[PDB]
Design an enzyme around this catalytic site. Structure first.
Site, mmCIF file in Angstrom:
data_model
loop_
_atom_site.group_PDB
_atom_site.id
_atom_site.type_symbol
_atom_site.label_atom_id
_atom_site.label_comp_id
_atom_site.label_asym_id
_atom_site.label_seq_id
_atom_site.Cartn_x
_atom_site.Cartn_y
_atom_site.Cartn_z
ATOM 1 N N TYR A 113 0.732 -1.260 0.000
ATOM 2 C CA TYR A 113 0.000 0.000 0.000
ATOM 3 C C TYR A 113 0.766 1.318 0.000
ATOM 4 O O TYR A 113 0.170 2.360 -0.264
ATOM 5 C CB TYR A 113 -1.019 0.003 1.144
ATOM 6 C CG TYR A 113 -2.128 -1.000 0.922
ATOM 7 C CD1 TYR A 113 -1.919 -2.365 1.143
ATOM 8 C CD2 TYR A 113 -3.359 -0.597 0.404
ATOM 9 C CE1 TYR A 113 -2.905 -3.303 0.847
ATOM 10 C CE2 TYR A 113 -4.349 -1.523 0.103
ATOM 11 C CZ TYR A 113 -4.118 -2.876 0.325
ATOM 12 O OH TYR A 113 -5.101 -3.791 0.018
ATOM 13 N N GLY A 129 2.662 4.172 -1.512
ATOM 14 C CA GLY A 129 2.796 4.649 -2.873
ATOM 15 C C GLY A 129 1.399 4.592 -3.462
ATOM 16 O O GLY A 129 0.433 4.354 -2.722
ATOM 17 N N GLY A 156 -2.048 3.449 -5.256
ATOM 18 C CA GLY A 156 -2.832 2.234 -5.181
ATOM 19 C C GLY A 156 -2.573 1.365 -3.978
ATOM 20 O O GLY A 156 -1.996 1.808 -2.984
ATOM 21 N N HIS A 181 -3.519 5.664 5.976
ATOM 22 C CA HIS A 181 -3.363 6.965 5.350
ATOM 23 C C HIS A 181 -4.062 7.002 4.002
ATOM 24 O O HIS A 181 -4.735 7.972 3.667
ATOM 25 C CB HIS A 181 -1.887 7.302 5.168
ATOM 26 C CG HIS A 181 -1.656 8.646 4.551
ATOM 27 N ND1 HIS A 181 -1.333 8.812 3.223
ATOM 28 C CD2 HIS A 181 -1.731 9.891 5.078
ATOM 29 C CE1 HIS A 181 -1.216 10.099 2.957
ATOM 30 N NE2 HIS A 181 -1.454 10.777 4.067
ATOM 31 N N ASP A 182 -3.898 5.934 3.232
ATOM 32 C CA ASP A 182 -4.514 5.836 1.920
ATOM 33 C C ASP A 182 -6.051 5.973 1.992
ATOM 34 O O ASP A 182 -6.657 6.650 1.159
ATOM 35 C CB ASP A 182 -4.091 4.510 1.286
ATOM 36 C CG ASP A 182 -4.510 4.394 -0.158
ATOM 37 O OD1 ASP A 182 -4.617 5.444 -0.836
ATOM 38 O OD2 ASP A 182 -4.715 3.246 -0.619
ATOM 39 N N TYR A 187 -7.151 9.720 2.900
ATOM 40 C CA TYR A 187 -7.206 10.628 1.761
ATOM 41 C C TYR A 187 -8.504 10.416 0.982
ATOM 42 O O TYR A 187 -9.181 11.369 0.579
ATOM 43 C CB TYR A 187 -6.000 10.386 0.852
ATOM 44 C CG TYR A 187 -4.806 11.241 1.203
ATOM 45 C CD1 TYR A 187 -4.628 11.732 2.504
ATOM 46 C CD2 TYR A 187 -3.871 11.592 0.228
ATOM 47 C CE1 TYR A 187 -3.557 12.557 2.820
ATOM 48 C CE2 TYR A 187 -2.795 12.419 0.532
ATOM 49 C CZ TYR A 187 -2.648 12.900 1.825
ATOM 50 O OH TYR A 187 -1.609 13.747 2.105
ATOM 51 N N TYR A 240 -2.840 23.085 4.674
ATOM 52 C CA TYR A 240 -3.293 23.304 6.035
ATOM 53 C C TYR A 240 -2.218 24.012 6.838
ATOM 54 O O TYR A 240 -1.203 24.459 6.293
ATOM 55 C CB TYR A 240 -3.651 21.980 6.712
ATOM 56 C CG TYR A 240 -2.645 20.870 6.505
ATOM 57 C CD1 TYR A 240 -2.905 19.832 5.609
ATOM 58 C CD2 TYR A 240 -1.436 20.849 7.211
ATOM 59 C CE1 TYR A 240 -1.996 18.803 5.416
ATOM 60 C CE2 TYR A 240 -0.516 19.820 7.022
ATOM 61 C CZ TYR A 240 -0.803 18.803 6.121
ATOM 62 O OH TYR A 240 0.116 17.811 5.892
ATOM 63 N N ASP A 257 -2.134 13.018 7.608
ATOM 64 C CA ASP A 257 -0.692 13.061 7.405
ATOM 65 C C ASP A 257 0.118 12.895 8.680
ATOM 66 O O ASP A 257 1.100 12.155 8.701
ATOM 67 C CB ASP A 257 -0.289 14.367 6.704
ATOM 68 C CG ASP A 257 -0.823 14.463 5.271
ATOM 69 O OD1 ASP A 257 -1.308 13.437 4.736
ATOM 70 O OD2 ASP A 257 -0.746 15.566 4.677
#
Lengths: 118, 118, 118
Positions: free
Chosen positions: B26, B28, B30, B46-47, B50, B66, B92
């Site tokens: 995961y 990077g 996709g 994190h993916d 987003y 931000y 993040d």
């Protein structure tokens, strides 16, 4: 939704929801005294989380069906717009994960009526 | 904003963002299969964070700027009123810190096309 | 409010609020430089949390009385509707817990004026 919470438990952990039906002072319907260990502490939190859920408009911890995905052993609460759904999924994800990282003290199964939960 | 996530990474961790461009299933672009380790899980979370950000009005994970501060190794998200800015900075920060505490299994670099991300 | 944060500390930890009154670069009023250790980071975070609390309407970190319960060593923030109360109780509960799990390096008591908080 309780059925979603049950699945989240085996998603994140090796043990199933039945393992926590009669554990410590707070796993199961109700809670008295102080949590005996980390796991019981988990149930203590989740228990208060559900309690708090009621404070959300049209929110019932047991009825509410939310959106989530399980990528054994990962749980993702995908709800953003539906605050009740978001809140509830978080409570359950929290518990499931907490339940998995916490040790299971069989010594603490069936202590409910003992001086442990006074 | 992505340039902000990058700096957060080296703020909270030792390894820079380039270190993760090619990690596991995961990290990077996709992602498929089960995350292979704690770090890959970090990227997996994190993916999805987003992806969830898009559900916020006027919110784009990549271009949204931000407010945050870095007192190496500490990261602070300052946004309170701006729900999108707040949500994103958090995604993040969560990742940057997760990446820092997570071990780096060099054995898990370049496995995307292997039977592990199946 | 502050009296509730003080009590939360005794609830979640062994050491009381006076213990942190003079610790590291951030515990206690003010704060500058890099947090010297885990505990100091705790104060750093909590400090930024109180600062952020002012961005909430009718929200004063020191004045605001919230709802919470202590079941030593557990803390529960019961506020849901009152965003300010909720936010502030979280700051404190977070700090109280962070404080309890973090190690106390007596070597970092009274270093505020040294080369370490530059």
């Amino acid at each position: 939704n309780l059925q979603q919470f049950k699945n989240m438990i085996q998603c994140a952990g090796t043990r199933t929801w039945t393992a926590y039906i009669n554990y410590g002072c707070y796993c199961g319907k109700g809670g008295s005294g102080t949590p005996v260990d980390k796991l019981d502490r988990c149930c203590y939190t989740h228990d208060h989380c559900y309690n708090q859920a009621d404070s959300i408009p049209g929110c019932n911890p047991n009825i509410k069906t939310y959106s989530y995905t399980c990528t054994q052993p990962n749980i993702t609460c995908t709800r953003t717009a539906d605050a009740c759904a978001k809140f509830l999924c978080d409570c359950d994800r929290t518990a499931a994960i907490c339940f998995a990282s916490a040790p299971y003290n069989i010594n603490n199964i069936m202590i409910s009526a003992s001086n442990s939960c006074q």
